[PDB]
Amino acid sequence: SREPLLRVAVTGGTHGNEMCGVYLARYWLQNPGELQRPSFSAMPVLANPAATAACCRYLDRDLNRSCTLTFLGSTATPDDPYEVKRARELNQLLGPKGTGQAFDFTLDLHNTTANTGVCLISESNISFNLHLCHYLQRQNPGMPCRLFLYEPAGTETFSVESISKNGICLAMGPQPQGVLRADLFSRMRALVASILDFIELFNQGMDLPAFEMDIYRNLGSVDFPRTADGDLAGTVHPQLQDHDFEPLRPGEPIFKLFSGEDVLYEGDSIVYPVFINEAAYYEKHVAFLKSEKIRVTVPALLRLTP
Amino acid sequence: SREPLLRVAVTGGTHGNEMCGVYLARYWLQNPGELQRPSFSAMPVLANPAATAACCRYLDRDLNRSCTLTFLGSTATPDDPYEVKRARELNQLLGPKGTGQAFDFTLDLHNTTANTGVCLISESNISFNLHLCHYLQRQNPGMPCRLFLYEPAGTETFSVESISKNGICLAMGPQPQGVLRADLFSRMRALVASILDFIELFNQGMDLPAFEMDIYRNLGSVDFPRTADGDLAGTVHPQLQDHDFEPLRPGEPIFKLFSGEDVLYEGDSIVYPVFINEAAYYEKHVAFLKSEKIRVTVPALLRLTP
Ligand SMILES: CC(=O)N[C@@H](CS[C@@H](Cl)CCl)C(=O)O
Ligand SMILES: CC(=O)N[C@@H](CS[C@@H](Cl)CCl)C(=O)O
Ligand SMILES: [Cl-]
Ligand SMILES: [Cl-]
Ligand SMILES: [Cl-]
Ligand SMILES: [Cl-]
Ligand SMILES: [Zn+2]
Ligand SMILES: [Zn+2]
């Protein structure tokens, strides 16, 4: 029988310069009304305080690559990276990751400089999460709302939502870092209201019929064309730029070198590039990500089994 | 009689995270060919080295607000801001500002997160500079190429181009910081080639007939709606966002508060907002800039007077 989700968090500011998250967090800390539902209330949290204030992605280490049980379970020192110190505080608050104490759910807000529009990033295929995406699609006709599935290859998970029993990132782009677009703030806000609505109904005992949907499963990344120096030698090609989620046949151009030469996609088959030309992924050696567009079957989530 | 411009510089990377400049600079340092013209060669320079590498705007102080004669003429200490140390090195190289030693001309490259497209920022109305903009307009039909006139209210000038006898910024947006768009890199590159072409002809003794053009003269800025805390209380309104250089009548909306309320433009007459929602201007308390669209007469620049 269905367990209601009662300890629910919404984290903004995991990256200090992704502004929808940041300003929603700050706002709700002052104005928690809109996070109240009948069966539960979602705790608003500003994930990376120091970064949010310096308005940069991270101080010492990406907070969202810092929540492995190794990191979390390690022994303090003087000069642990700030984000490691902070990760542990989030473990204290939302976890401990892996224990029965952890939150029921974390909704983690993000912005991107890629043209992804609305995208939910999920680290497993737990049906709850696909039912959720699907609820969002139904509530917003004609607005795309896509699911990026990024399972961990290893066993170690790294992200802030990985701390709670379940979780998911709401990613929205394009937006420059340090820039708050009114249209995106308000659309994030609405989608968050809707995600909370969803959880209300789930808790209320709502039947969620099995269904089918297309999703986007990570195949791994592609780095920028580089000089032996490890420097850029070109950038995302004009015909790829801004076309996240659209199909990339082999033989099509993906980069343009400074020397004027087109670079071409070499691969077995058609893929779906996602997070094309994200500011933050330059250092992570990632010009974009390769996904396969599959169609999965999502089991029903019922109050009672039949 | 006309003096040729012979010591000419192109600075990129004044802000470490504005990428067209940065990658053009790095490129030319390796590939100086395309900066050679018959009568002169332009020296490529990476303006802010430390910032360019940390990929941020500035380390201690905006390099482009750090070239006043006070700063330049001040006495070293241990803990002068890095950009002040660096400003002085640029004075050594391109100046000294105000002396007969200084460069003939500095072309200073910039990117913006506002939707300005191609914009030349000039700190005086020296006809050379308007003749230049005008040359750019003629060479690129249908592509807007606008002149933002930002005279110094005081006497003290602050920018990197202010060091050379004359100079001008080439600004192009929109682009997120830390993101290099291929279309913008290459269009900057072409426009730079063209600016050098211009100087070639000027040096060759070319007659530049008097003419008339519209320009955009600064009237000052408008800050974001703020909480008494000095925090944001809203952002650029959806109908203003992305509409740089287009007219703002009074009574039209300029902000949208988080509380849902439209803020309205209050002023004497129609203005032309420029650099709407630039990441970097959040701390400088500037949501956008007000300009008046005037039509000036530009004197001829002839080889011989008639
Ligand atoms: C560019 C950016 O800050 N977007 C987030 C997305 S969430 C993560 Cl669970 C998987 Cl990639 C990230 O890159 O960390
Ligand atoms: C946002 C940005 O980095 N653009 C430059 C423009 S040039 C300056 Cl001469 C007058 Cl505003 C600046 O703001 O410094
Ligand atoms: Cl993109
Ligand atoms: Cl559903
Ligand atoms: Cl804008
Ligand atoms: Cl002309
Ligand atoms: Zn993020
Ligand atoms: Zn700049």
Swiss-Prot record, chains A, B:
Changing residue 281 to A: Drastically reduced activity. Expressed predominantly in kidney and to a lesser extent in liver. Weakly expressed in heart, small intestine, brain, lung, testis, and stomach. It comes from Mus musculus. Residues 1-204 are annotated as: Hydrolytic domain. It catalyses: an N-acyl-aromatic L-alpha-amino acid + H2O = an aromatic L-alpha-amino acid + a carboxylate; an N-acetyl-L-cysteine-S-conjugate + H2O = an S-substituted L-cysteine + acetate. Plays an important role in deacetylating mercapturic acids in kidney proximal tubules. Also acts on N-acetyl-aromatic amino acids. It is a peripheral membrane protein. Optimum pH is 7.5 with S-benzyl-N-acetyl-L-cysteine as substrate, 7.6 with N-acetyl-L-histidine as substrate, 7.6 with N-acetyl-L-tyrosine as substrate, and 7.7 with N-acetyl-L-phenylalanine as substrate. Residues 205-306 are annotated as: Shielding domain. GO terms for molecular function: aminoacylase activity; hydrolase activity, acting on ester bonds; identical protein binding; metal ion binding. Its EC number is 3.5.1.114. Keywords: Cell membrane, Cytoplasm, Hydrolase, Membrane, Metal-binding, Phosphoprotein, Zinc. CDD domains: M14_ASPA. SUPFAM superfamilies: Zn-dependent exopeptidases. It comes from the Eukaryota. This is N-acyl-aromatic-L-amino acid amidohydrolase (carboxylate-forming). Substrate binds at residues 57, 64-65, 171, 281. Its main location: membrane. It is an enzyme of class 3 (hydrolase). NCBIfam families: PRK02259.1. Exists as a mixture of homodimers and homotetramer, both catalytically active. One of its GO terms (cellular component) is apical plasma membrane.
